[PDB]
Each structure stands twice: as structure tokens, then as C-alpha cells.
Amino acid sequence: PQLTPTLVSLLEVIEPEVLYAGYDSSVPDSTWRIMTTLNMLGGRQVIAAVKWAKAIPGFRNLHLDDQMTLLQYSWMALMAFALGWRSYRQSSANLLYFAPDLIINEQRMTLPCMYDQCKHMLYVSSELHRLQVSYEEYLCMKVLLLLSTIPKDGLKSQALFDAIRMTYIKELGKAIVKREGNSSQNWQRFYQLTKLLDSMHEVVENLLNYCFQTFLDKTMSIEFPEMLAEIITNQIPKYSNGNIKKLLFHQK
């Protein structure tokens, strides 16, 4: 614990503070103007995630090509999941807290296609408050999402990886026990939370093909930052042939 370390404490303090979208609301809102701003925001969050990833105890020890394969596969999972947490802890509505200087309210919610997509996102935020997921449970789950998707033929450093993943699985278990202690449903909850994790593959699948659509469709006004553009241009291939292995806690 103190003597040495908890991974969940060493995490809670590598956890990135919110970034400000830099949105100017002195002007009317629009579908394009929002999505484009979010993408821009997304690019900065992902850079704020690249650090996080390397500052994750155990991460920097994988094969270079692995550590970036992981970030490339799961950046959406990280962004979407952290989206929920901000919405949850910051607000409470079927809204979304992308930044303190940018919140999609039921007003912006009603924009052209704004909600078609804001859908799958809203979801993750629902569960987190439903299961009253705790900051300690959330932080472990978020790490596990980074470690949720690998190349179809496994990583290069598969052994070391499998070892790290299991560590944070146990850390998640630790979190569940260390909340209240009413063991009664602890294993119940562990089942649930890892079920949540498994379902993030779904929400990512959907959020990703819309990311890909807005990125290929040059009629829409949506623009992407350099950082995201490179990651996306690299992922559209893989996701358009089949090189991907989605890890599951329950092959139900």
C-alpha cells in the first residue's frame, strides 16, 4: 500500500486534468462547428493520453510497436470512457461534459445530427452513475481499456503484456473490495464491471465508423487535427481488412 504502491493511487495522480475546448459561444452553434471543435479537442486529449500511457506503471516496458498499437486501437475507448466520467462527476443530465468550456446541453443536443452520435457516448456515462462506478474503479477500468485491443496475431511482447493486463484486473478487483467491503455482491459487481468493459468494444465499433465517415466524407464541414488524422488514416486500413483482436472478460 503506502510502504510500496497501489497502482490505483499511482494512477489517480497521473490522471489528466480536463482540457479546455477553446470554444467561442459568442456565435450560434452548429453541427459542423461542434464536431470539428471536438475533433480538435480530441487531438489534444489523445496527446494528453500518450503521456498518461507511458506514465502507466508497466506500459513503457512493451515493444515500441506494441505501445503505439495499443494507443492506436483504443484511443476512442479512452476518450469515450473518460467522456462518461466527466459527464457523471461534473453534471448529471443526458448531456456530455467534453470540457468546462464546452458542454452539450439539451439545447445543443437538439442540433441536426448532434444526437445521432451523442447517443452511444451518453450511454457510457449512464452506466458509470448507474453502477455508481467509483473514481477508483473507473481509473482501473480506463487502464484496462487501453489494454483491451491488440493485433489479430497478438502483440510482439505478448507475454509481458498479458502480465500487465492481469495486474490491473486484480487492481480492479482490489477497488471493488476497497469500496465498502460488503463482499456479498463483490464478485457480482466484478462480473458487472468487466461486462461493462466488454461492451465498450461495441460503443467503440460504432463511434469509430462514424469517426471514419466524417473523415472520408468531404461534403460535411468536419475537420480533424493532424494528430487524429494520422491515427485515423492508419486505422481505416486495419479496420477495413480484419487485423484486430478484441479481448473479452466474458465470451458469453
Binding site: 500518450v50 503521456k51 513503457r60 515500441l64 505501445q67 503505439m68 494507443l71 494528430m227 494520422e230 491515427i231
Partner: peptide
Amino acid sequence: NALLRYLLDKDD
């Protein structure tokens, strides 16, 4: 490729 690989592999 390029952009991402650089960012991690360093050592603040």
C-alpha cells in the same frame, strides 16, 4: 506513424 512514435519514445 511518425507523429505518434516520437511522442511516447521520449523521456520528459
